[PDB]
Each structure stands twice: as structure tokens, then as C-alpha cells.
């Protein structure tokens, strides 16, 4: 059986990814299953289950198992400050909030869930993540050091620190609900010299910025207000898979 | 041509590694390459280059040309705040001191040296560095706070982070010129639960310490002290890698 990272390596070694992002504390359980079911048939390719509103423990196994009850998609944690770690959930980006002005996202955090995290079969998955102006919720609770959109040069040093550190994707975040998206001569630049995968989230609503990006060299596209607040969540998704897909 | 981490791997795969560190501040640099030249005979794999001692950047080069003009084996940069990088050495440990209290340690400077880095073909080995009691001098200026020497618990908290976040290697540290190593129990326990190489360095004077250490199963012993301090380097080395490879 494949892992996660290999599914990710493999798809994005000669094409691109398409994520679907739940907020388990937005909407009830079974509504988020019905978001991730439109999201599969849609084209996406792994769910991603996370977000700002704090989480109930009980109430995120509650949304994990039905989500992976109506899908055949593998769901990843999208870890907040939280330890939303939860056993019901094929994997998790284990990740550091590298441009975090505080040791909490930085460090401190992943220590105290590595020893639960150890006990579980669960899949770890190594990420670098990157909040970028205007950073929304995640860069105000992750004390963010934002960096500006368009600031190829912080962007390069922070993404090649995190090759460097090991770390399998690095993620560009603009922020839950972003008004912008990370600019494209950011994805550009660091693709020109950067070895592992790079995923963009944040702000993404359209299929021509999801393509835009994508033919920037994005490897990956998170799309998440779009999903959960669309009413028709395939008719919104669909055309921003396809788009990523003719690149 | 092998990289420098495939040879660490491939000779801890059914073997252990013994390393030996010279302070470059601390002696000129043809005594530093003759340090080296009998460590090598000694039986050493890698010279280490690294300090407390702040460094001139006109002087390590000299340094490093003057040991790799001696030996053949591979100079492996082990950095400090300095930005000790030259691009006269074959490697660097890219480190992050985890458990230290400034940013600066575990991502700040690693983020300023990153571009740079890029820019030469010295090959970039993620390690995590992890600071003891008593820490010396690093755990002093690295705000490390430090680990106690038989804390299984914690220890294993920052070795399992370490491994998910992608690094390659850990390296265990009680400080430059420690009375004491770090506890076998640590290391035991942390290998039982870790898939990279475990490096201990610190406070290993003996070969009995270096054996004990190694037969408590670490992969890899960095002595530093002891090969700076003996006015005949071969006979107090060449015992400790003897001893170490019986294991
Ligand atoms: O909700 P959006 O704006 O699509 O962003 C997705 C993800 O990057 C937020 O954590
Ligand atoms: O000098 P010693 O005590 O051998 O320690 C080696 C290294 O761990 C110090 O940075």
C-alpha cells in the first residue's frame, strides 16, 4: 500500500494536486462528509481536515470517520494549535510554522504530540509551512512573521531552510479566507531552485488563479472556503480541478 | 560519488562511526591539520571543524585547505551562530538546536545561511541538535534548555520530533569538554524507538565511555577534547575507535 507522500510524489513528479480543506468546527459532521463526497466526484485528490475554530476532540473523530465512511479519499490532519490529533485519520502534516515569531509553532508543539503520535500508525508527514501577508487567522494565532506576497527572496530562504531541515513539502499560506493569493513570481523564483514539492493555499476561488498558479509551478492547490461555503460544492471544485489538470 | 550521508548511513547500516571534532579557534591551522592527519590514522571517519571559540572567517578557510590538504577524509562543517560556512569543506550539518529558547537557534540563523548555501556545492546534511546537561558553552550561548542526561522521556520527545520533521540525523550534546556524556539509558531508549542515526558527542574522554556508549546503541561518537588536548593525538584516539568498533 502506498503511503500519502509517495501518492504525492508520484502525482506531482509529472502532473499537479488538487486538495479539498474541511473546518470540522464550521459545520456538522455529516455536512462535512457530504462536502468531501461533492469534493471526490469533483476530482480532488486527498481531503485535508483542519482549521482556526478550535476543535472539540470528540467532535473531530465525529467528522473524520464520517468523511471517511461516504469516501475512498485518504484524510490528512491540518494540524492547529489544538493537537487534533486524532486515530480515525490516514495522515498528518507534521509541520512547522517556520516564519512563526513564537517556539510554540515553531517547535513546541510537535514535541509534546510526538510521543502520542509515535503510539499511532498514523502517517507523519514532513511539512514547512509558510504564512504569507495577509495571513488571516493562522497569522494571527501562529504570531507570523507574514511575508509579503510578492517577497521572492524571504520566501527562497525560508523554503530553501526547509529542504535543507529535511522536510518533504513546504506549504505557501496566505490565510483561511484570504482576500489574495500568494503571488505567482514567489511560486516562480523557488521553483527555479527548490527539489521538493511546493503547495499553495489561501485565497484560491477561481479555476484561473488555481490554473495561474499552477502553470507558476505550483505543485499542489488547497481550496477551502470555496468548498465550504459553496451550496453546490462539485459545481464550484470541478472547474477549478480541471483547470489545474491542463497543466 | 558518494555523498557524505550515504557513507554515514551505509557505514552505520552494521557498524558504528567515530568522528573526530577540532576547534579551529583554538589552535593554528597546521596544527589543526596535523590533528587530523593522526586522527585519520587513528581510524577516524570524518574531521568535524566547529567551535565555541568565535572564528575568524580568513581563518577557517586557512584551516580547513590546511586539513584537507593532509588527509582525504571529508570535512564536515559543524556551524555555530558565526555563519561558519566555506566553501573549502565538503559538508555542513544543516542543525537546528530544537530544545534551545531563541528562535535564532532552531530556525533564525539557518534561514539567513540558506541562500547562501545554495550558492555552493558543499552538501547540506539536516541534523537535529539536541543540547544536555551540563550543555557547557553551546547550551550557554544556544539558550538551550537543557535536557537532563537520563530524561528518556524528554530526550525521546525531541528525537521523534526530529525524525518527523524529516532530519536525517540526531546528534545528542552534553557541551565541548563536558565532565559527563549522556546517559546510555537515553540512547537506549531512543533506539528503540527511532529510525535515523543517533550521534552522541560531549564529555567522551575514555574508550570505555565511547564502547559503553556505543553498545547502549549509538551509531556515531564525535570526540573533540580529547584530540585537541593530547600532545600525542594517535595514542589517545586510536584506542576509542578501536574500542568503538568492537561494537
Ligand atoms: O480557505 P482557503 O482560502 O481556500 O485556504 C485554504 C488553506 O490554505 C487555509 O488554511
Ligand atoms: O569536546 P568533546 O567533549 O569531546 O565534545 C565533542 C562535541 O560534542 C562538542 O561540540
Same sequence: chains 1, 2.
Avoid at 485535508?48 to 473524520?64: K, L, Q
Amino acid at each position: 500500500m502506498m503511503t500519502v507522500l509517495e501518492d504525492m510524489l508520484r502525482k506531482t513528479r509529472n502532473g499537479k494536486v488538487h486538495m479539498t480543506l474541511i473546518d470540522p468546527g464550521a459545520k456538522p459532521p455529516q455536512e462535512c462528509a457530504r462536502i468531501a463526497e461533492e469534493a471526490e466526484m469533483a476530482g480532488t485528490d486527498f481531503i485535508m481536515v483542519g482549521g482556526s475554530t478550535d476543535i472539540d476532540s470528540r467532535a473531530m473523530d465525529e467528522a473524520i470517520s464520517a468523511i471517511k465512511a461516504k469516501t475512498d479519499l485518504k484524510v490528512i490532519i491540518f494540524p492547529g494549535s489544538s493537537l487534533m490529533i486524532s486515530p480515525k485519520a490516514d495522515a498528518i502534516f507534521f509541520m512547522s510554522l517556520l516564519n512563526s515569531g513564537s517556539l510554540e509553532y515553531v517547535v513546541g508543539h510537535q514535541v509534546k504530540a510526538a510521543i502520542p503520535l509515535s503510539a499511532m500508525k498514523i502517517e507523519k508527514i514532513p511539512m514547512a509551512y509558510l504564512v504569507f501577508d495577509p495571513g488571516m487567522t493562522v497569522g494571527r494565532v501562529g504570531k507570523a512573521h507574514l511575508i509579503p506576497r510578492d517577497d521572492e527572496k524571504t520566501a527562497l530562504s525560508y523554503a530553501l531552510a526547509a529542504q535543507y531541515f529535511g522536510f518533504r513539502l513546504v506549504y505557501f499560506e496566505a490565510g483561511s479566507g484570504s482576500p489574495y493569493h500568494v503571488g505567482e513570481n514567489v511560486v516562480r523564483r523557488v521553483k527555479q531552485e527548490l527539489d521538493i514539492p511546493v503547495i499553495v493555499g489561501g485565497g484560491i476561488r477561481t479555476p484561473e488563479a488555481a490554473k495561474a498558479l499552477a502553470q507558476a509551478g505550483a505543485d499542489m492547490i488547497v481550496t477551502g472556503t470555496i468548498a465550504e461555503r459553496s451550496v453546490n460544492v462539485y459545481e464550484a471544485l470541478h472547474p477549478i480541478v480541471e483547470s489545474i489538470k491542463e497543466v
